[PDB]
Design a protein around this ligand. Sequence first.
Ligand SMILES: Cc1cc2nc3c(=O)[nH]c(=O)nc-3n(C[C@H](O)[C@H](O)[C@H](O)COP(=O)(O)OP(=O)(O)OC[C@H]3O[C@@H](n4cnc5c(N)ncnc54)[C@H](O)[C@@H]3O)c2cc1C
Ligand SMILES: Cc1cc2nc3c(=O)[nH]c(=O)nc-3n(C[C@H](O)[C@H](O)[C@H](O)COP(=O)(O)OP(=O)(O)OC[C@H]3O[C@@H](n4cnc5c(N)ncnc54)[C@H](O)[C@@H]3O)c2cc1C
Ligand SMILES: [Cl-]
Ligand SMILES: [Cl-]
Lengths: 656, 652
Amino acid sequence: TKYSESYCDVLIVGAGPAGLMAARVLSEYVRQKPDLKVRIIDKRSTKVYNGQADGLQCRTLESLKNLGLADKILSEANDMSTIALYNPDENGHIRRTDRIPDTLPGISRYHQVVLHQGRIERRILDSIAEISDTRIKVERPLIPEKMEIDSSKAEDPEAYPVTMTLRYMSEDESTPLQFGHKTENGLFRSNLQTQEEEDANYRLPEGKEAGEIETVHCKYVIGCDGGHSWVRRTLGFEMIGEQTDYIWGVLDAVPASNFPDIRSRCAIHSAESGSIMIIPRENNLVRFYVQLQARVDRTKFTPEVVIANAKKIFHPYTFDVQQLDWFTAYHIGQRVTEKFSKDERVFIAGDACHTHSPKAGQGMNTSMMDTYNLGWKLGLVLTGRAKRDILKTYEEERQPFAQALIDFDHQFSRLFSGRPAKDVADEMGVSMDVFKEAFVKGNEFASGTAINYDENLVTDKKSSKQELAKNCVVGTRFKSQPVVRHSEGLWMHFGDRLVTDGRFRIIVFAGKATDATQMSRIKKFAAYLDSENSVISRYTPKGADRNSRIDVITIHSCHRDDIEMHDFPAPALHPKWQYDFIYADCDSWHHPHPKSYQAWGVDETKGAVVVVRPDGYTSLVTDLEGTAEIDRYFSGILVEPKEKSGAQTEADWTKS
Amino acid sequence: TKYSESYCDVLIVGAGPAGLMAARVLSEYVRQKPDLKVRIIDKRSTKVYNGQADGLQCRTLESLKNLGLADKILSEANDMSTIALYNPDENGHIRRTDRIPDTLPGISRYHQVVLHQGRIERRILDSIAEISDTRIKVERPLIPEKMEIDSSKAEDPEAYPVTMTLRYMSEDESTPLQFGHKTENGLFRSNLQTQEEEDANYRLPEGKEAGEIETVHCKYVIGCDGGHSWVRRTLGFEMIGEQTDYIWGVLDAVPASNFPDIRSRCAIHSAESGSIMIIPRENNLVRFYVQLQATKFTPEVVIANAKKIFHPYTFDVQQLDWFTAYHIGQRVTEKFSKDERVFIAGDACHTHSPKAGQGMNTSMMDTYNLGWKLGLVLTGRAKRDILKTYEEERQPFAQALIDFDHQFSRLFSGRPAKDVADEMGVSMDVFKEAFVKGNEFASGTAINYDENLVTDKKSSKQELAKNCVVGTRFKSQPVVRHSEGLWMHFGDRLVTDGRFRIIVFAGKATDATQMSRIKKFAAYLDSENSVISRYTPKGADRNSRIDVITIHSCHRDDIEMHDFPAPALHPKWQYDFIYADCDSWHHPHPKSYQAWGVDETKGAVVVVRPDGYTSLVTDLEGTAEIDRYFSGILVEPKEKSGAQTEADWTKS
Ligand SMILES: Cc1cc2nc3c(=O)[nH]c(=O)nc-3n(C[C@H](O)[C@H](O)[C@H](O)COP(=O)(O)OP(=O)(O)OC[C@H]3O[C@@H](n4cnc5c(N)ncnc54)[C@H](O)[C@@H]3O)c2cc1C
Ligand SMILES: Cc1cc2nc3c(=O)[nH]c(=O)nc-3n(C[C@H](O)[C@H](O)[C@H](O)COP(=O)(O)OP(=O)(O)OC[C@H]3O[C@@H](n4cnc5c(N)ncnc54)[C@H](O)[C@@H]3O)c2cc1C
Ligand SMILES: [Cl-]
Ligand SMILES: [Cl-]
C-alpha cells in the first residue's frame, strides 16, 4: 500500500449531477485564482452506466443557460409538451379524459425537456474542462474511508479543518452488480439497495491490500454522494421519512404500440392493475414508469415482469418493445435531512439530503440547483471575495426547499400509485379530479421557478421597497423578460445577459431617461457609482474592469430612436467601447413593445434599482436614491480587495 | 515524375463554400450508395481561417437548417438587426437620418446573420465527415493542369466523358493565407479547436507525393474554383461585365470608436470622402467596408480613409483579424454547363460587390440546387435530363444578382447629392429605396423558377394553395405536431436528403365528406401503380423516396392520428407525419393554412422538391397530375414496392 498526503481547498465526493454542477460552478473561481485546488472523486467505474435521470425543469434550464450549457442540451432533448390523463370509464377501459400542459404557459422561456443523463453529464464535463482549462478532472475510482473534522478550526481561513482519508480502489471494486440481467440496468443504485449493501459492495475484500491510502487535508468538503451518502451518515445527520410497499419499474424503450398518446407525457390509472407514467424521449425512445403488483429479489426483477404489467395497464391498447436500452426498479418513499452542513465546512447536497419518487422528475434538478446555490458562495469565500458567514445561507435556503419537495412528492406519489375511485362513493380510491388538480399545481412547484428564499445575509427584504419592482420579489429568481439591446436593436431575452460567473448585478431600471427630471436622478446615481466609496469603487480591485465584480446594467423605457447610449453617464452606465450594458423596453422590427417594465412591475417613468445575486436571485429592490441600502447590502457580504479601484477617473469616452 | 490514373463519379474543383456545399449535398448519396466516388480538391494547403465571406441570408439559413447546419452556425453568428443610414446635413456633417430592418419582417423565420467563412467551412467540413463517414475528404493542395471532354459520350451513363489531369503540389507552391490559423491559449482544446489545428497543417492525401500527376477519368466535374475559375476559363465561358474604378478596403477589427451605431449595420455616405458600410460581427468584431480615394494597399491606408469618412466621430482599431481590397465590378456567364457533364457554380459563374453579402449565399445555393439533381442521377433514381434545369434555374438568378448589384454598388459608391439639383450625386431617398427593395432580393427567398422539367406550373391548380406558388420555396409556417402537441416550424421537418415531399393538406378531416376524399387519396397512395408504390424500391420504407406528410386543420383534441389512413398517412410506429394547424399550450392558432393560402376545409396537395421548392399544386383528386409529374423525373427501381399490403397497425 502506498501512503500519501496532500492538501486541497475543496473536495467534492461524488460526480453525479450535484457533484458535477459543483465542479462546474467552482471551475470559474479556479480559473480566476489558479492556485485554488478543487478535486472531485467518484467510487464507480464508467463501464456500467451510472445514471438514471432524464428530465430538466425550467429553472434548471435557465441556470444552465447562464452557464453556457442550455443550447447544447436543447439541441438533443425532447419537449414532452403535453400531459395526457387516462383513467377508467364505466367498463373499466382506460381512455383520455383530459390534457394539461407539461410546462405551465408563461412560467419561463424554457420548457421542461428530457434527455439521457449521460448526455447531460457529457455537456457539463466538457464545460468543466473548458472553464478549468482541463485542471479539474474527475478522479476515479476513489472512496473515503475516514473523515475527521476539527470544529475548533472552523473559522480559521488558513486552516484545513477536514481530514479525508481516501482509498484508491481496484476496477473490480468499482464495478456495480447487474444481477444476471442481460439488459443494462440501474438496480444497483435503486432504493431497493440498502445502505449496508452499498457500503459492502465497494469494500476492500478480505485478504487484499489497498493500492493507495491518501490523507487529504481539506478546507471544505461537499458530499454529493447519493441517497445512501457515506458523508451524511458519517456526519450523523438523520433522515426522516418512511418507504412504502409500492413498487415501480422503468423501461427505456423504443415502443411498438397503438396507444394514441405514446409520444406524449401521460399518466395512466388502470382500473385494478396500477399506474403508468409515459415520458417520451429523444431518438424514438420512450421511458415508461410502470407500477408493479405489490425485500424484492433483484435477480427476479426482469424486463419481462415489467412489460407484463405494462400490457395489463395499457389494456386494451397494445404494448410491445422494439428495443430495450435500460431498465430499473424503485419503491415509493421520501426522506430528507434537517441539516445540510457541519461547521459550514462539510456540506451535503442532492440525493444525500433528499430522496423521493421520480413522478415529477425532481431529483437531478434539485441536486444541481443545490450546488449551483452552494458553489458561488464557496467560490467567493475561497477567493477572499466574501465573508464566510454567507455559507450559512446554503442550509437556510436549500433545506426548507428540500422539505417542500418531500411534502409535494409525498402526496403526488401516493395519488399516482393509488387505485382510481370508481365513483364518488369509492372512498378508498383516488379521485381523478384531485389528481389532475395536484398535477396542475405541482407543475408550478416542479418548474423550480416559484422558490422564494427567506430573508438572510444575502437576501434583503427589510431594506427593500418592494413596490418599486412588484414582480421582482426579493428572494425569488430574477425572471427574464424580452428587451431590445440598444447598440443594434437586437430583441433578446434579458436572462441571457445574466451569465453566471461569480458577479452580482445591479439592474438599473433607468425609466424615462428622455425626461430631464428622470435623467437628473440617473446622473446622481451614476455619480454615486463613480464615487470613491461606492460598491463599484471599493469592491473592484485596482486595475480591474469596473463591471468585473458587480455588473451594472441599464434597462430604460425609451425607444432607441429617441435617446442614444451616449446620452447615459459614461463610463458608469455606458462603459468604454463596450455594448452589452444598455437595453430598452421598446418596440422593435420583429416584435411589438414587450411591456417588460410592466411584467417586472416597475414604473415606466421612475424606474427602480434591483440587485441580483450571482445565482440569479433578486436580493434587494430600491430606488435610484437608495445608495445607502445598496451600500449596506454589499458591506454585509463582500470583502474589500487589498488595493481598490477607488473613484472613477476616466473622462467620458464618448466626447474623447 | 510519378504518374497515376484513376476513376471517379464526381470531381469537385475548389473547396470554398460552393464546393463544400456540393460535397455536403452529395455526401448523402454516397452514404446510400457507397460504391459512388466523389472527390473534392483545392489548390490551397488549408481551409480559410478568417475573413472573406461572412453573410448568411434567410433562404441560405433555411437550407442550412434542412442540412443540420443552422443551429451550430447560429450559436456563433451575429444578427445585425438594424441598418442605420447616415449621410451629410446642409453643413456636410454626417447624421443618422433613418433606420430600416436588416431583415424584412415576416420574410422568413430566420434573420440574416454574419460569421466568417472559416467557421462556415469548419461546420460544413464536419457535416461532410459525419454524413459521408469520412468517405469524402478534401484533397489539398492539388490543382488541375488539363481537362478533356468527349462530347460524343455525354449521354452514355457508363462513360467517363471528362478526363482531368491533376498535379499534387508541394507546400512551398501553395499560396498561403495572410491571416491563417492561430493556436488557442491554454491547455484545453474542444473537438472543434482540435480539428481546426489539424486542418492547419500541410498534408497531401495518404500515399501521394508532391509532383505526382494523376489522370482522373470523371463522369462529372463541378468547377467551384472561385472568381478566376480555371474550369470556367478552360470551358471558354466568357465572364461578361465591366469593372469600375471604385476601390474599397475591408477591415475585420475590434473597433475603438464613439460612433453611436458602431454595433449596428450602417451605411455612411460622407460629404466628400467616400462611403462606409459597417457589418457588426461576432465576438466584438466589426467588419468595415471602406471606400478608398485614389502600388500596394495596406490596412493603414484603409484606416486613414475610414477616419476621414467617420469624421467627426473617432475610429481606431484595437485588433485586426483580416483585411483585403477590391474593385467594384460585376461579371456573369451565359452558360453554367458543358454537356451537363462539366458544371460551374459560385463565384466561377458570377462576381459582384459585397454590399449585400451575396457571394457565399448565392454560391452555396447554386450547389444546393445542382447537388440533389446530380445525386439522384448518380444513384440511378432520376433521368439525366433533370440536369438541364440547373442552368435554367441558376443562370437567370445570377443575372438578376448582377443587375441588382450593378445599381446598388454604384449608389453605395457615389457622392451623396448636396441638394436636389446635385445630379452628379446620389439621392439618399433613392438609396434608401434601393436598400429596402434590395433586402427582399438579398434574402434569397423571392426566387421564382420558370416552369421546367421539375417545376410544373401548367398542371397545377395554383388557387388551391395561393401562397405556395409553384417555383418558389415552400415557406415554413408553424404547426402543432399531433403526436405530443409540440409547436414547431414545419420547415424543420423538410430535412434535405434527396426525398421529394407530398404535403397533404387534409383540411377539415373530422368532416365526413372531407375524410372520404382523404381516404380515396390514401387508396391511390396504396395502389399498385401509385408514385409511392412505383418509386419506392421493394423492401424499402414507403416514405424513403417520396415523403408523404399530412397537415390537417383540426385541433388535436378533436381527431386522432389513428383516424387517418394507416399506414399510408399514419405510418407504423412512426410519429413525424401528422401535424395540425391549431391552438397549442404556448401559442395561439398559427393560422398557417391561411398563411399558405389553402382552404381550411378542402385543403390541397402540394409537391415539394428535394431542395424545398414547390413543384406542383393540386387537389386530392389530382393523382393523375402527380403521376405525370414524377414520371418525367424519376426512374423506377428494378424491383418496386408495389401495392401496400400491410394491415392497419392501429387496429390491434
Ligand atoms: C428511476 C429514476 C428516474 C429519475 N428521473 C429523474 C428525472 O427525470 N429528473 C430529475 O431531475 N431527477 C430524476 N431522478 C432523480 C435523480 O436520479 C437523483 O435525484 C439525482 O441523480 C441525484 O443526484 P446526486 O448527484 O445528488 O446523486 P447521485 O446521482 O446518486 O450521484 C452520486 C455519485 O456519487 C458516487 N458515490 C456514492 N458514494 C460514494 C462514495 N462513498 N465515494 C465516492 N463516490 C461516491 C456515485 O457513484 C455517483 O456517481 C430519477 C430517479 C430515479 C430513481
Ligand atoms: C480574397 C477574397 C476576399 C473576399 N472578400 C469578401 C468580402 O469582403 N465580402 C464578401 O461578401 N465576400 C468576399 N469574398 C467572396 C466570397 O468569399 C465568395 O463569394 C464565397 O466564398 C463563395 O465563393 P466560392 O465558394 O464560389 O469560391 P471561393 O470562396 O473563392 O473558393 C474557391 C476555392 O477554390 C480553390 N481554387 C481556386 N482555383 C483552384 C484551382 N485551379 N484548383 C483547385 N482549387 C482551386 C480556392 O483555393 C478556394 O478554396 C472574398 C473572396 C476572396 C477570394
Ligand atoms: Cl447555452
Ligand atoms: Cl441545424
